[PDB]
Design a protein around this nucleic acid. Structure first.
Ligand SMILES: [Zn+2]
Ligand SMILES: [Zn+2]
Lengths: 147, 645, 183, 65, 120
RNA sequence: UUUUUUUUUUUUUUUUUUUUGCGCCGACC
DNA sequence: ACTGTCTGGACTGGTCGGCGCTATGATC
DNA sequence: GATCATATTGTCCAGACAGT
């Protein structure tokens, strides 16, 4: 059908999607599918023939705020369904920020990238001596792209 | 990696329930660092005497820590009342703390010997009548800020400390007694150089780092200020988190300066095995180093929270206590005699496979402060020795005439009404000077007050907190007699700048022991500035003065020194005071002392490694040892790996 | 480089100096203000010679002191880049030699004294050559050219001066005479 | 805890896999996908990406790690 | 920046600075405190005394004949030549190489021959 | 019966001196 | 070019004292 | 039973403005 956006509480998109799915199953709502990417915070995607079905499905839930008044083209959310490694798309020599891990809130420079083990080796920029460290690909965020 | 800690714990529990009578009621058996903890419901039957605990410790070859079950716990007020009633009034108990999570009561007393008992029977009596496992620590006669802060940090983070100890105990006993296929020794720093010491002990199962330190002389160059972080073995150990433990020989910046840096960037998460005096002194020195780097305007190496994390990850070991820090490595500490808490690291890898002794900084002659270094070991194959004074012509003067000259110079200065200013290190020579002065003044030689400014008072308090780590004479005076040499009324502490100004402006003679040997900071510079024009005063140098420092300028004989004034104009200091230099109070071992230690060590090591000194000095010491005793000697450079077995 | 400048400035003279000569009080205030610091534009302020002209006082709100327009002569010393100086070695260091060329002391690096691999002698604080066998000691007439000037701060001692002796014609007076002997 | 299958990317609360009967399930997964209609556009997009996904309506995971 | 504005500036030799520093030392001695001046002024006076190659009047007369001799030179390098007092071609060559002009040997020889008089 | 690589010396210590805001209500001149 | 309409704003100074108010739902 | 992210988006006077 048509892709619609539902604004939900940040960090609790999966539970809201599960409640919407259970309500649709129990009450026979005309809901086609629900997509809740982990990278997107506070927003979920629901496929329905019309926005009235989405509005009727999300009502009665404290954690579903409102439905965005618009229709998303499928090309915008097409890349979300494709499975790609988090390490891929990273090149050595640039600067990244570590969102999670033991090095939370630290800037680092990418040194080595390998897609086989899904790990990326980075060097802290604030360290007085270069100490390479191995961190997960999804933990880092690209601040700038140079070389 | 694969672990078998559960099977080992099950076997240990089976052995315990086979040996311990059933009436004890054993509930839980777990590992807390390098010691075993057993929880029972009837402590009376478990420890009616020390023979059962001794037999259990001998059979299991572990440190047994019997604790009551948390369900059977007396109320804290009733427990405190019972503990106070049981302990004799001679032992003045100051603070009592309780741990609701695990059965343990911390007792702070001025006389821990009475609380512990003649053979530990008082601890058993307390934990039987009160159902609380007792831990006794000494309350120092002089209050120490660092020790109080460390104790408060340990008490306020009990849950994190217990979790860290449980993780360390699980990691240590991941497998049973394992015979290492090979033993490797690599030096990441401190090899053929002075400072930034770093020793890595590598086996096929566990890795051990020894005295991770920093260099202050070459702090401008990052390639020489810090140990070699680019070593492939060290990189592999740090990246995979295979570092089992870190052991610090003694509390100095060249042996413990780089320790908080690992915790700053979360490069390490295991335990640190130092003596409590070493831990306290190294925390004080690291805090002072961070403050100095902050004041100089440069970027600090780490933060005080990193020092707090180092405190939270430190396990305290006493002298002569054997603990298992790895599946194949056993660690014990022996007295070194260099400074307070200085320990010679002895590693027992395997079940008699090999033995390594890392002396570090040590002294082999008796001193006024500490006993000479331990030269007897149960087994010794490889010896790692310092070479600070390894030169052939390096011969420090004997102590007795050096202290006689110091005493006569001080007496001559005080005879004419002058003031004696003695710049000194925060730890080491300063306490020896205070002990010599106290001995001289105890017979009524001098009545003038002795003023300690800066870190001298804190170091003195830390020294008072651990009298068992001192020499036999001071131990006999403190324990057998009622006299404490550090508690002499002549020793006074100046609180603020007003007290220092009153001391300077006072016409009465006095002795001032500052905390900066090079007159590069602290109250030493102010004392020198305000006492230089007076010809009656004198300044005594007890340490080497580096080039480019004010102290070297005064020592060389400069009558006037141009300095920057408060208003931004050049100021001239007229040095009319007498200048003296007595370098006989150095805590480092002499070349003759090193040769005597090599000759008198038992058993004779198969090989000797000379480190911690200049390259030519290390080579000269190794060649002299090889020519005199025939033992094979090596003086490897940095990033050099030696396969001992 | 010694320089003489005529400077016009407004001088504040406190009421405690009202009974004194206006020129003398202005000179005292100027000596207290400008003497002993480093000026970025003019260099080291050495001394205030005399006050030529003085104007009538002006009283501003909030201050009882009088303000006068004064004309005075200042003697200053300014080090410039690529400037040859003559001085005497006063301090010896392992990393170089300090030569007193005036109100400030320059620094000549160990590689910079001469065209030879000179090493330091700690026992006598002298520099001994390998091939030339030349020795530098205290109280030696030397000549050098300034190559580095730091004006980062107003403190004279905090500023640093670097000079060179690699170039021909720079060195000890005896060495200079030895060089002129061949020519 | 909820774990996702490594074969059909199906999240189930029991050891048995009700789609392919696989015994290797991963406890770490992101980008939960809920399928209620087989002929959905996103279900068709997931079908060409992972062949075993979107066969039966239910919870699904984009990647398995 | 000293003062509000600068009226005139002049380059003086070592001897003039020595005379001014001696006058300031006398003025400081006339003052009640025993310290005539600060460290830098005393050091400058000592250096000028130890390098007092010529009398102040001799320095001034050498400066004015140097000004009247050639036009491309200025007061600063004239005072520099007075202080250095060269006696051959190598020193004047190495002190004029980094300057804005590279004079031919004939005028350098003329400068040597005029400054040869009244020299120590 | 066979092509296209290069080569050497100058920067020092184990460290230091005092409740803000928000709004309401009553009241005085 | 007039004429009714929409929008923005400021609402006398000081003083006295009192009386509340400054987190919450969901795992681990 | 302890912690952690998140927590929603009164009338009148004067100047500018569509309407005729
Ligand atoms: Zn050391
Ligand atoms: Zn499956």
């Amino acid at each position: 059908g048509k892709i619609f956006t539902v604004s939900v509480t940040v960090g609790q998109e999966t539970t809201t999607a599960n409640l919407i799915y259970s309500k649709a199953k129990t009450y026979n709502l005309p809901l086609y599918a629900i997509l809740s990417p982990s990278k997107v915070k506070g927003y979920i995607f629901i496929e329905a023939p019309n926005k009235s079905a989405v509005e009727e499905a999300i009502r009665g839930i404290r954690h579903a705020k409102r439905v965005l008044p618009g229709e998303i083209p499928f090309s915008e959310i097409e890349h979300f369904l494709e499975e790609k490694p988090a390490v891929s798309g990273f090149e050595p020599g640039d600067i990244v920020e570590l969102i999670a891990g033991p090095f939370k809130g630290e800037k680092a420079k990418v040194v080595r990238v390998d897609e086989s083990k899904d790990e990326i080796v980075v060097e802290l920029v604030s360290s007085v001596v270069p100490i390479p460290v191995t961190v997960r690909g999804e933990y880092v965020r690209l601040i700038s792209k140079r070389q | 990696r694969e672990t078998f800690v559960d099977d080992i714990l099950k076997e240990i529990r089976e052995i315990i329930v086979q040996m311990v009578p059933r009436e004890a009621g054993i509930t839980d058996v777990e590992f807390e660092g390098p010691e075993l903890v057993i929880y029972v419901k009837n402590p009376e039957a478990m420890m009616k005497d020390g023979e059962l605990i001794k037999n259990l410790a001998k059979v299991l070859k572990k440190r047994i820590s019997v604790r009551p079950d948390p369900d059977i716990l007396l109320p804290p007020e009733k427990a405190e009342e019972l503990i106070k009633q049981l302990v004799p009034p001679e032992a003045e108990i100051t603070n009592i703390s309780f741990d609701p999570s695990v059965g343990e009561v911390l007792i702070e007393a001025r006389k821990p010997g009475l609380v512990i008992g003649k053979n530990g029977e008082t601890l058993r009596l307390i934990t039987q009548k009160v159902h609380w496992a007792p831990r006794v620590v000494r309350t120092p006669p002089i209050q120490s800020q660092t020790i109080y802060s460390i104790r408060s940090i340990l008490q306020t983070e009990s849950k994190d400390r217990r979790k860290f100890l449980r993780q360390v105990g699980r990691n240590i006993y991941r497998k049973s007694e394992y015979k290492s296929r090979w033993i490797r020794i690599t030096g990441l720093g401190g090899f053929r150089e002075v400072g930034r010491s770093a020793l890595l002990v590598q086996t096929d199962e566990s890795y051990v780092l020894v005295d991770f330190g920093v260099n202050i002389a070459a702090l401008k160059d990052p390639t020489k200020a810090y140990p070699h972080f680019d070593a492939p073995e060290f990189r592999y150990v740090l990246d995979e988190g295979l570092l089992d433990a870190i052991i610090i020989t003694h509390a100095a910046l060249d042996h413990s300066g780089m320790l908080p840096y690992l915790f700053r960037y979360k490069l390490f998460d295991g335990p640190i095995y130092t003596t409590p005096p070493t831990r306290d002194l190294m925390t004080l020195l690291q805090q002072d180093f961070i403050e100095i780097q902050h004041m100089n305007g440069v970027e600090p190496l780490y933060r005080p929270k990193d020092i707090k994390e180092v405190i939270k990850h430190t396990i305290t070991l006493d002298y002569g206590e054997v603990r298992d820090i790895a599946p194949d490595i056993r660690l014990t500490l022996h007295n070194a005699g260099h400074i307070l808490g200085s320990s010679i690291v002895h590693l027992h890898i395997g079940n008699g496979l090999h033995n390594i002794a890392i002396t570090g900084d040590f002294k082999f002659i008796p001193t006024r402060l500490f006993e000479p270094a331990v030269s007897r070991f149960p087994r010794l194959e490889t010896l790692v020795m310092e070479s600070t004074y390894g030169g052939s012509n390096d011969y420090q003067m004997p102590r007795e005439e050096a202290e006689k000259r110091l005493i006569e110079v001080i007496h001559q200065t005080l005879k004419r009404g002058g003031k004696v200013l003695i710049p000194a290190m925060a730890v080491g020579r300063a306490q020896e000077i205070m002990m010599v002065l106290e001995e001289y003044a105890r017979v009524g030689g001098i009545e003038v007050p002795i003023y300690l400014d800066g870190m001298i008072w804190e170091a003195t308090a830390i020294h008072t907190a651990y009298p068992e780590y001192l020499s036999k004479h001071i131990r006999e005076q403190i324990f057998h007699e009622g006299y404490n040499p550090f508690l002499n009324p002549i020793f006074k502490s100046v609180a603020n700048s007003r007290e220092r100004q009153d001391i300077i402006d006072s016409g009465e003679p006095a002795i001032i022991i500052a905390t900066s040997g090079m007159l590069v900071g602290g109250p030493s510079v102010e004392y020198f500035k305000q006492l230089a024009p007076d010809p009656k005063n004198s300044i005594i140098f007890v340490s080497y003065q580096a080039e480019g420092t004010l102290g070297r300028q005064v020592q060389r004989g400069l009558r006037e020194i141009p300095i920057v004034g408060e208003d931004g104009r050049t100021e001239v200091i007229n040095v009319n005071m007498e200048v003296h230099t007595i370098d006989g109070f150095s805590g480092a071992a002499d070349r003759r002392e090193l040769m005597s230690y090599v000759a008198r060590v038992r058993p004779r090591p198969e090989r000797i490694i000379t480190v911690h000194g200049e390259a030519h000095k290390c080579l000269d010491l190794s060649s002299s040892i090889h020519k005199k005793f025939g033992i094979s000697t090596r003086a490897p450079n940095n990033l050099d790996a030696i396969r001992l077995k | 480089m010694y320089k003489l400048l005529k400077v016009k400035d407004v001088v504040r003279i406190p009421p405690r100096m009202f009974t004194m000569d206006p020129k003398e009080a202005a000179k005292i205030v100027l000596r207290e203000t400008y003497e002993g610091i480093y000026d970025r534009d003019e260099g080291v302020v050495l001394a205030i010679l005399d006050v030529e002209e003085i104007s009538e006082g002006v009283i501003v709100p909030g201050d009882g002191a009088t303000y006068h327009e004064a004309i005075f002569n200042v003697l200053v010393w300014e080090p410039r880049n690529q400037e040859v100086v003559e001085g005497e070695v006063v301090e010896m260091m392992p990393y170089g030699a300090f030569i007193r060329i005036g109100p400030m002391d320059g620094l000549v690096h160990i590689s910079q004294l001469m065209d030879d691999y000179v090493v330091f002698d700690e026992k006598n604080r002298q520099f001994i050559g390998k091939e030339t066998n030349r020795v530098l000691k205290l109280g030696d007439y030397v000549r050098a050219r300034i190559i580095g000037v730091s004006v980062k701060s107003r403190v004279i001692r905090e500023n640093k001066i670097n000079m060179t002796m690699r170039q021909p014609g720079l060195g000890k007076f005896e060495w200079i005479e030895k060089e002129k002997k061949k020519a | 805890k909820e774990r996702a299958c490594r074969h059909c990317h199906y999240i189930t609360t029991e050891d048995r896999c009700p789609v392919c009967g696989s015994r290797d399930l991963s406890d770490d997964w992101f980008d939960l996908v809920i399928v209620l209609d087989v002929e959905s556009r996103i279900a068709k997009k997931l079908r060409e990406s992972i062949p075993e996904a979107a066969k039966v309506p239910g919870k699904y995971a984009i990647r398995v790690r | 920046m000293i003062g509000r504005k600068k009226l005139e500036e002049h380059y003086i030799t070592i001897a003039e600075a020595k005379e001014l520093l001696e006058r300031r030392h006398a003025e400081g001695l006339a003052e009640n405190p025993e310290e005539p001046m600060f460290y830098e002024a005393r050091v400058s006076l000592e250096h000028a005394e130890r390098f007092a190659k010529l009398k102040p009047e001799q320095a001034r007369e050498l400066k004015e004949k140097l000004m009247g001799l050639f036009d491309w030179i200025n007061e600063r390098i004239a005072a520099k030549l007075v202080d250095i007092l060269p006696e051959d071609y190598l020193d004047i060559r190495v002190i004029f190489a980094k300057e804005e002009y590279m004079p031919t040997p004939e005028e350098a020889e003329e400068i040597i021959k005029v400054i040869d008089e009244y020299r120590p």
